[PDB]
Amino acid sequence: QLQLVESGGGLVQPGGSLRLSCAASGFTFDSHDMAWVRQPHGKGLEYIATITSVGSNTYYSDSVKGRFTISRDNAKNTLYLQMNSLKPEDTAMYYCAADLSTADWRANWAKGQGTQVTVSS
Amino acid sequence: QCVNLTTRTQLPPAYTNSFTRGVYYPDKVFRSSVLHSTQDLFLPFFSNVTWFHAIHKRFDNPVLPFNDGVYFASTEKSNIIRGWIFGTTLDSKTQSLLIVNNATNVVIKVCEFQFCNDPFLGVYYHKNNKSWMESEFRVYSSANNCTFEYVSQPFLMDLEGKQGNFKNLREFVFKNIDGYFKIYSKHTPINLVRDLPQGFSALEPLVDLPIGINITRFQTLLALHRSSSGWTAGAAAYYVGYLQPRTFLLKYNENGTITDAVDCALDPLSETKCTLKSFTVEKGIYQTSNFRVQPTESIVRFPNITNLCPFGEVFNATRFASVYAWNRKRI
Amino acid sequence: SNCVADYSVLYNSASFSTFKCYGVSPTKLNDLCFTNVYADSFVIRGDEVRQIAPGQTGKIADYNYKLPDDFTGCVIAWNSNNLDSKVGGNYNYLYRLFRKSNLKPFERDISTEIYQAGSTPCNGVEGFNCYFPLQSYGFQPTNGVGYQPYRVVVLSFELLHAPATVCGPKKSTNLVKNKCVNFNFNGLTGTGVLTESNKKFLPFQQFGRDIADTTDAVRDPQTLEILDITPCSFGGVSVITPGTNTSNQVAVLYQDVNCTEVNVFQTRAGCLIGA
Amino acid sequence: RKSNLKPFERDISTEIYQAGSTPCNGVEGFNCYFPLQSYGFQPTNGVGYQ
Amino acid sequence: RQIAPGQTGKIADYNYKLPDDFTGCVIAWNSNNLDSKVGGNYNYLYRLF
Amino acid sequence: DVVNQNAQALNTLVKQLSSNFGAISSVLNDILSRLDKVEAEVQIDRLIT
Numbered sequence: 001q002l003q004l005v006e007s008g009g010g011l012v013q014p015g016g017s018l019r020l021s022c023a024a025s026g027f028t029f030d031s032h033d034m035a036w037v038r039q040p041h042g043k044g045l046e047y048i049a050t051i052t053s054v055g056s057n058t059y060y061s062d063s064v065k066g067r068f069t070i071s072r073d074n075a076k077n078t079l080y081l082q083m084n085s086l087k088p089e090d091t092a093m094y095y096c097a098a099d100l101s102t103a104d105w106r107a108n109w110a111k112g113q114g115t116q117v118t119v120s121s
Numbered sequence: 122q123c124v125n126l127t128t129r130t131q132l133p134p135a136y137t138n139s140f141t142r143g144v145y146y147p148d149k150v151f152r153s154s155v156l157h158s159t160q161d162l163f164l165p166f167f168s169n170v171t172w173f174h175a176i177h178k179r180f181d182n183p184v185l186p187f188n189d190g191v192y193f194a195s196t197e198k199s200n201i202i203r204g205w206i207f208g209t210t211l212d213s214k215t216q217s218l219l220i221v222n223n224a225t226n227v228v229i230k231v232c233e234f235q236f237c238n239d240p241f242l243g244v245y246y247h248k249n250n251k252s253w254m255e256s257e258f259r260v261y262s263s264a265n266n267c268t269f270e271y272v273s274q275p276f277l278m279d280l281e282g283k284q285g286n287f288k289n290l291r292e293f294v295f296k297n298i299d300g301y302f303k304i305y306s307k308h309t310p311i312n313l314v315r316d317l318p319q320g321f322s323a324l325e326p327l328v329d330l331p332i333g334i335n336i337t338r339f340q341t342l343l344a345l346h347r348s349s350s351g352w353t354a355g356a357a358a359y360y361v362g363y364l365q366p367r368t369f370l371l372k373y374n375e376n377g378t379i380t381d382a383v384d385c386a387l388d389p390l391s392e393t394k395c396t397l398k399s400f401t402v403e404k405g406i407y408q409t410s411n412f413r414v415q416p417t418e419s420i421v422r423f424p425n426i427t428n429l430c431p432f433g434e435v436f437n438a439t440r441f442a443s444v445y446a447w448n449r450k451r452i
Numbered sequence: 453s454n455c456v457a458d459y460s461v462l463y464n465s466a467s468f469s470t471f472k473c474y475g476v477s478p479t480k481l482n483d484l485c486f487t488n489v490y491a492d493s494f495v496i497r498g499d500e501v502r503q504i505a506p507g508q509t510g511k512i513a514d515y516n517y518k519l520p521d522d523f524t525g526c527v528i529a530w531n532s533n534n535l536d537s538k539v540g541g542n543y544n545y546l547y548r549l550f551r552k553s554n555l556k557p558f559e560r561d562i563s564t565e566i567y568q569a570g571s572t573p574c575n576g577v578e579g580f581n582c583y584f585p586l587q588s589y590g591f592q593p594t595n596g597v598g599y600q601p602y603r604v605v606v607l608s609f610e611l612l613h614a615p616a617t618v619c620g621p622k623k624s625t626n627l628v629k630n631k632c633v634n635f636n637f638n639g640l641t642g643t644g645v646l647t648e649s650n651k652k653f654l655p656f657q658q659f660g661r662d663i664a665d666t667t668d669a670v671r672d673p674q675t676l677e678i679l680d681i682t683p684c685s686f687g688g689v690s691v692i693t694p695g696t697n698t699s700n701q702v703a704v705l706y707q708d709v710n711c712t713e714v715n716v717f718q719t720r721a722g723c724l725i726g727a
Numbered sequence: 728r729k730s731n732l733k734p735f736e737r738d739i740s741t742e743i744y745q746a747g748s749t750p751c752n753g754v755e756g757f758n759c760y761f762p763l764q765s766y767g768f769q770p771t772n773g774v775g776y777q
Numbered sequence: 778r779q780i781a782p783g784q785t786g787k788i789a790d791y792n793y794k795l796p797d798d799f800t801g802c803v804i805a806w807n808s809n810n811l812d813s814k815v816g817g818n819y820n821y822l823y824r825l826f
Numbered sequence: 827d828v829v830n831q832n833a834q835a836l837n838t839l840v841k842q843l844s845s846n847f848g849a850i851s852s853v854l855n856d857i858l859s860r861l862d863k864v865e866a867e868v869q870i871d872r873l874i875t
């Protein structure tokens with residue numbers, strides 16, 4: 001079974017730094033396209049970070065562009081995200097999604113469980 | 122089969138007069154003993170329709186334009202006219218109505234056809250044991266993107282076409298408004314009254330198709346019969362009239378059929394009949410409309426200024442302003 | 453065609469971003485009936501839902517998908533960002549950027565001819581003043597909401613032209629003749645007296661109309677017979693009285709009705725009650 | 728705002744908005760209001776505040 | 778900051794909603810001394826979801 | 827001329843009922859069974875005028 005267990009959440013100050021993890025098993029890791037998803041309190045879903053199959057392209061939402069850092073693990077197959085220069089409005093449940101990558105027109109984002117992150121002071 | 126005709130001959134486009142033919146039921150409402158005035162694409166009365174006849178070695182099947190919609194007629198005894206390739210540049214980019222009425226069923230195929238250049242069906246072997254059988258099925262071979270196909274119920278198979286006198290006749294109307302083939306149709310084998318189409322007969326709708334293509338040309342599909350190596354064009358004829366946005370006045374009878382009609386803009390007497398809304402005009406002097414001289418062409422006269430306006434300096438300025446003091450730029 | 457449409461379950465679902473109906477109201481869809489219903493599925497950019505209305509212009513409404521100005525339908529659009537977007541942009545969705553003129557409404561265009569920008573004939577290649585008209589969509593889920601893919605269905609229906617093929621869920625009742633009823637014949641509401649008619653309809657027709665163009669005779673869609681709608685409620689009421697200073701006795705003249713309500717005597721002006 | 732605003736007119740007057748009763752006459756301080764607040768042109772805000 | 782017509786949030790979805798034609802004023806003040814209890818004023822019961 | 831003039835004045839009045847007058851349809855009940863009352867007020871107001 002595909003398993004996406006998330007860890008590395010909590011509380012942080014405005015301007016601080018964080019790092020997320022996503023324990024990914026049950027699939028070939030470069031066959032599925034990996035992305036980071038947040039869900040604010042009172043809002044819906046939101047994409048903040050996007051990386052391709054071989055990890056050769058790192059893409060960022062405009063509200064988090066130039067501040068976050070997406071990466072990957074090509075030996076233990078675990079998804080990471082270095083969040084830096086944090087802002088108070090980033091209070092959200094940060095999930096972990098994985099595309100099915102089936103024939104380039106279908107998109108099945110295998111949503112994980114998410115770790116609760118609050119940005120308050 | 123990319124083999125053209127062996128005995129094709131260039132003949133001039135002979136004309137006839139469409140007397141009152143080509144009037145269709147404009148909508149699906151029942152009227153009774155009224156004179157209803159409508160305005161749509163109509164076949165104007167007393168106009169030239171092209172007399173395309175197929176005779177013994179002397180026939181052309183040209184590419185006819187499709188300005189606003191076309192009339193069609195068919196003076197057959199032998200079922201030789203089948204279908205209509207439609208389209209703009211006559212490729213696989215268009216869809217085409219075909220009625221391959223092979224004396225068994227009303228087999229209609231409305232697809233994107235594999236395109237043909239000189240297409241023909243044909244019956245053969247008629248000296249003995251004919252049975253009206255066909256083999257040369259070259260008007261259709263394959264068809265990708267078949268968006269439609271319909272099979273209507275069979276009709277009275279009138280194989281008996283009596284030689285000489287003019288009885289068996291059909292009348293179709295092919296127009297296209299907002300992707301819709303409002304194909305109007307009427308199957309009238311006329312009784313022999315006096316030798317010619319003269320009288321009145323109204324048309325009625327059969328189908329409507331959600332096609333949505335641009336059409337500026339069409340053709341007409343063919344067959345062959347004789348009692349095409351040793352074969353020629355079979356003895357029949359078809360008529361082409363174009364439709365124009367006219368205005369008619371239409372006398373529905375007691376039972377509800379259009380018995381008599383009045384074109385408005387034919388002659389001033391019928392314009393008077395359209396203004397009074399009656400087919401009988403008593404003695405007097407009547408005012409019809411205004412005399413309206415045509416406009417020739419459009420004349421645009423702007424002053425010869427060529428330098429642009431400072432839209433870069435305003436739309437993409439560097440030092441901005443605020444709502445406390447806005448910069449009224451003068452242009 | 454040939455089905456019953458539960459428009460309510462298509463409507464009260466909150467999944468749809470834009471549910472804007474044009475010829476009708478979206479609440480009487482469940483009772484009003486139609487003749488031909490067409491669904492037009494296509495995927496567009498985010499803010500381009502503005503350019504799907506009767507009369508809009510732009511780049512979707514002008515070159516590759518136009519609605520006529522007499523449009524009678526509903527437009528459904530919902531965000532499909534979680535099902536269309538890809539990590540490198542979904543290149544499987546395209547649009548015509550370049551067109552020679554405007555496009556006629558409800559007209560598909562599958563032409564691949566190279567749009568000659570300047571004067572040089574391109575001879576079947578792209579390049580300098582040879583612009584390929586069919587661009588692509590970069591559908592990344594990290595995009596802004598104005599570039600996110602919305603799936604749009606234009607649900608046009610052909611209304612008041614023909615016998616009906618698609619009608620919503622209302623149960624029919626039994627037919628009542630020769631009585632002043634409040635009828636609903638396949639979409640039209642009226643109030644009259646239904647008698648069996650002698651009018652003969654051609655089978656592509658349903659509705660007989662009089663000189664004021666009101667529905668005079670119908671075809672029952674359940675059993676295909678022809679009825680005859682005669683109105684109720686003839687005439688007016690006139691009160692015959694002596695002076696109030698003489699009596700309070702009155703008479704009542706119902707003008708030009710038969711004695712239907714019901715001394716009671718049939719004057720040639722109508723039924724006269726109380727004289 | 729001090730009075731009725733007529734259209735196409737800039738209110739560039741450097742008279743200080745006195746709301747209460749203390750006469751200010753051109754300085755700030757005790758109830759001497761100043762409606763000319765500033766723009767935060769930082770990229771940190773939400774898209775409804777840009 | 779979620780008592781507004783048309784907006785979303787915890788105030789604007791589960792327990793309160795404003796109309797778009799609203800006139801009037803939204804009045805509050807510093808009331809830390811007026812409702813707060815030492816262990817917490819859990820006598821002000823509310824429905825969260 | 828008296829009989830004809832009264833009859834033509836009645837037939838004109840009857841044939842004015844098949845006129846849109848700006849509205850969607852001359853049929854009152856089709857407007858009454860397509861639109862909500864807030865817009866049926868507009869279309870019926872054109873017909874009444």
Ligand SMILES: *[C@@H]1O[C@H](CO)[C@@H](O)[C@H](O)[C@H]1NC(C)=O
Nearest residue numbers: 136137138166167168169170
């Ligand atoms: C039909 O054609 C002839 C010759 O082309 C022409 O003289 C005649 O006026 C035409 N008829 C009409 C009604 O235009």
Ligand SMILES: *[C@@H]1O[C@H](CO)[C@@H](O)[C@H](O)[C@H]1NC(C)=O
Nearest residue numbers: 373374375376377378380652
């Ligand atoms: C109407 O139909 C009846 C039916 O028998 C027929 O007798 C009559 O001649 C028809 N009248 C007209 C004007 O068509």
Ligand SMILES: *[C@@H]1O[C@H](CO)[C@@H](O)[C@H](O)[C@H]1NC(C)=O
Nearest residue numbers: 431432433434435436437438
């Ligand atoms: C002004 O700026 C816009 C976008 O910033 C650009 O698309 C446009 O071409 C510019 N106008 C010029 C350069 O005249």
Ligand SMILES: *[C@@H]1O[C@H](CO)[C@@H](O)[C@H](O)[C@H]1NC(C)=O
Nearest residue numbers: 616617672673674675676677
């Ligand atoms: C409905 O049922 C009746 C008999 O119960 C039948 O005559 C009729 O044809 C049916 N309707 C349709 C559309 O077939």
Ligand SMILES: *[C@@H]1O[C@H](CO)[C@@H](O)[C@H](O)[C@H]1NC(C)=O
Nearest residue numbers: 708709710711712718719720
């Ligand atoms: C209606 O009036 C007619 C004469 O106008 C009369 O013969 C008939 O009996 C009346 N109807 C009834 C139900 O009494």
